[PDB]
Structures are given as C-alpha cells and as structure tokens.
Design a binder for this molecule. Structure first.
Ligand SMILES: Cn1c(=O)n(C)c2cc(Nc3cc(SCc4ccccc4)ncn3)ccc21
Ligand SMILES: Cn1c(=O)n(C)c2cc(Nc3cc(SCc4ccccc4)ncn3)ccc21
Lengths: 123, 5, 123, 5
C-alpha cells in the first residue's frame, strides 16, 4: 500500500555527491598511480562489483586506502567516480578506451555496455 | 511528486 | 557532453538498502525508546535535515549511537527509515499522525507535505 | 537505458 516519491533516489545521490564535494564522512582514499580520490565506501560498493568484493572482505573492509592496478588510467577512474555519484558519464572519443578498460576492471557492466555500443558505431 | 508505484 | 543512465540512482539506492539488510558497513545505531535501528550515516544525512545537522557536527559525527527524543514513535521512525532507503512510504490511516510528527522532527519536508495533503483530504 | 540528460 506504499506511495513513492519519484525524485527521491536522484535527490539522495545528489546529496551524497554534495557530501563528497565537501569531504563529509568520506572514509576511503582510492589511489590510481599518482592520483588520490576520496570517496564513501558504500557508494563505491553500490556501483562496482570490484568494490563490492573489496569492502565485503573481512580484512579489506577495514582499509582506509585502496591502491588500484598501475595500468588503470586516473582520468578514466575520475570519470567513473563522477558517474557513480551523478548517473552522468563524460564519454568522449579521447577517453572511451580508458573508460571502458576501467569499467571492465571495476565490474561496472552497464558502462562497459554503452562503451561497446559507442565503439561499434564508429567502426 | 508522489505516485502509486 | 555527458550521457546519463536513467536507472542509476534507483539502482544505487536499492544496493544501499541491500547493504543495510545484510548489515554491511552500517556505522550508526539509532535508538528510539526500546528499539534500535542500524543504518549508514551518509544515507541518513542525505535524507534528513536533522541527521545532516547531527553528522556534520564535529563531536556528534564520531558517535556510533544516536538517541532520539522519547516522544518519537519507533514504528513512525521505521517507516521513515524504509522510505529513506527505498523511496516508498507506507502511509496508513493508523500511522499517518506518527509518520508526520517523526518527519517534522527529522526535517523531511516532502514527507511532511504528503502527510499534510492526506490529512486535509480526510477532513 | 542511456539518454541525453
Ligand atoms: C557486477 N556489478 C555491476 O555491474 N555493478 C554495478 C555492481 C554493483 C554491485 N553492488 C552491490 C550488489 C549487491 S547484491 C548483487 C550482487 C552482489 C555481488 C555480485 C553480483 C551481484 N548489494 C550491494 N551492492 C555488485 C556487483 C556489480
Ligand atoms: C530540510 N531537509 C530535508 O527536507 N531533506 C530531505 C534534507 C536533506 C539534507 N541533506 C543534505 C543536504 C546537503 S546541502 C542542502 C542543505 C543542507 C543543510 C540544510 C538545508 C539544505 N548536502 C547533503 N545532504 C539536508 C536538509 C534537508
């Protein structure tokens, strides 16, 4: 018998992104070569199969710093982190290969899917 | 907004 | 130049609710008289002006237990916590006054608004 | 789903 507020999920996500912008309650630093990204573990887990596996591990759930594979592109990671917090993916000709490789590593299936479709359209 | 889901 | 995944915000919220159901990364217990509710501080802050004020406070942000006012109804709080994590509000004739009073206390303006409209329709 | 926002 529930009623539903249509905009609630997007309002929550917008407020989580505002917390991230203000560095409020951020609890992990993701390191991607020379770059560092502060984030909330729960948002990362909710968006990525890799982070879900990492933060449900009984030892890794306690870490405040996670180092990604050195082959991961920081700009690709930055674009995906923004997508996690906003539903918007800044996909461009100059970044699509790095975004797709990063989404494959992070296990973000819907992003891998749109990248594959955009690449197929150019060939 | 509110709707019947 | 971004593209947007329509279902992303609702998928994130669904995954945050799955973490709550499995007690994964929950970092606060909200006590409402004799009842206890485990939750994620960031989701509570994103949904409630009261929790936003509590967890942005330099002392209270560190607390693992928050006690609400003894006048707050636990069922009303439970209904609102479910709404935070799902966008669905289980509003019924038998709970509407408690839900509205709890939403006023938690500073959840859209919920207070729908409660006021449902009460006005019955008079 | 993907759209132009
Ligand atoms: C593969 N994959 C993605 O493409 N994304 C966006 C993912 C997001 C998640 N995050 C979840 C899933 C679940 S229960 C579902 C589940 C759990 C483990 C494995 C597979 C499926 N609870 C909370 N957070 C997990 C995997 C994802
Ligand atoms: C009054 N009120 C509601 O009805 N809801 C659903 C609220 C949710 C929030 N959570 C926010 C807000 C912001 S910035 C906006 C802001 C901040 C403080 C005061 C007022 C407004 N960043 C992250 N989480 C705050 C107040 C809320």
């Amino acid at each position: 018998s529930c009623i539903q507020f249509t905009r609630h999920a997007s309002d929550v996500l917008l407020n989580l992104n505002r917390l991230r912008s203000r560095d409020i309650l951020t609890d992990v630093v993701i390191v991607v070569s020379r770059e560092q990204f502060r984030a909330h573990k729960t948002v990362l887990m909710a968006c990525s199969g890799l982070f879900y596996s990492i933060f449900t591990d009984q030892l890794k759930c306690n870490l405040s710093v996670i180092n990604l594979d050195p082959e991961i592109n920081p700009e690709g990671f930055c674009i995906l982190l923004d997508f996690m917090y906003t539903s918007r993916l800044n996909l461009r000709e100059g970044n699509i290969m790095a975004v797709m490789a990063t989404a494959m590593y992070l296990q973000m299936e819907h992003v891998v899917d749109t990248c594959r479709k955009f690449i197929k359209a150019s060939e | 907004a509110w709707v019947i889901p």
